[PDB]
Single-chain antibody
Framework: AVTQSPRNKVAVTGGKVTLSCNQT?????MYWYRQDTGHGLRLIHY???????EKGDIPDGYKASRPSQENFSLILELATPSQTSVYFC???????????FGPGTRLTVLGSDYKDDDDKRSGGGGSGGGGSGGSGAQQQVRQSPQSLTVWEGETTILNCSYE??????FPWYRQFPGKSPALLIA?????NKKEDGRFTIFFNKREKKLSLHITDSQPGDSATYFC??????????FGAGTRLAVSPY
């Protein structure tokens, strides 16, 4: 079924990344994402009808192959101190299903951030450093940046935006614990107000954005929710949702 390299190991500057995922859980489409802040979800590989696994967002420095629609495998041989992350082999069906995330892998290439309090955040000594391709890739999903933590698991409000002209709905979901993403629900922006569980959504026309309310929350960094769209087929556009957190006191 949807699985990933059960092994666990780390790599160094251009070390190596061994990953192995399988597909056979009744899913007609297998998506591949990676936990990467800045934008949150990081699409890199795409496999749904076999012979397909290289059309995420900015695939580069990785090798993947899909000889069989059920068997898959990919690795890397040149990672940088800011590209590694946790590989998650997600696989769901079409229409409205939860991404059956399996035991993904987690490895980092070079890096530590243990005592970086009295040093500049720019190692000007090789290892890339800007270069060509400074900006690019447009953006549609715009979730209120600047995360925030509320006292205890109180309620909170979220905001999302979009610049597409053919979106159908936005499967509100991402991951609550830290290494186990999951689907929650899906809006549609057609009734101006909806409710699925204990939170409702609103349609802001004056600002063209989606705002919902979530009450009754629990500690543990609260949870991270993303707002992506999928009006098209095999194409989810996310814009780094928000990461709700709970205060220590």
């Amino acid at each position: 079924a949807v699985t990933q390299s059960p092994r666990n190991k780390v790599a160094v500057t251009g070390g190596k990344v061994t990953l192995s995922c399988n597909q056979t859980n009744n899913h007609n489409n297998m998506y591949w994402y990676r936990q990467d802040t800045g934008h949150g979800l990081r699409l890199i590989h795409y496999s749904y009808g076999a012979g397909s696994t290289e059309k995420g967002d900015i695939p580069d420095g990785y090798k993947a192959s899909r000889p069989s629609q059920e068997n898959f495998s990919l690795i890397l041989e040149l990672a940088t101190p800011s590209q590694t992350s946790v590989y998650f082999c997600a696989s769901g069906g079409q229409g409205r299903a939860e991404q059956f995330f399996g035991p993904g892998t987690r490895l980092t290439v070079l890096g530590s951030d243990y005592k970086d309090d009295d040093d500049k955040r720019s190692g000007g000594g090789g290892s890339g450093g800007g270069g060509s391709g400074g900006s690019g890739a447009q953006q549609q999903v715009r979730q209120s940046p600047q995360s925030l933590t509320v006292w205890e698991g109180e309620t909170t409000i979220l905001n999302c935006s979009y610049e597409d002209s053919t979106f159908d709905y936005f499967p509100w979901y991402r991951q609550f614990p830290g290494k186990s993403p999951a689907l929650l629900i899906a809006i549609s922006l057609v009734s101006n107000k909806k409710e699925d569980g204990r939170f409702t959504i609103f349609f802001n026309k004056r600002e063209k954005k989606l705002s919902l309310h979530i009450t009754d929350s629990q500690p543990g960094d609260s949870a991270t929710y993303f707002c992506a769209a999928t009006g098209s087929f095999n194409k989810l556009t996310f814009g780094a949702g928000t990461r709700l957190a709970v205060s220590p006191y």
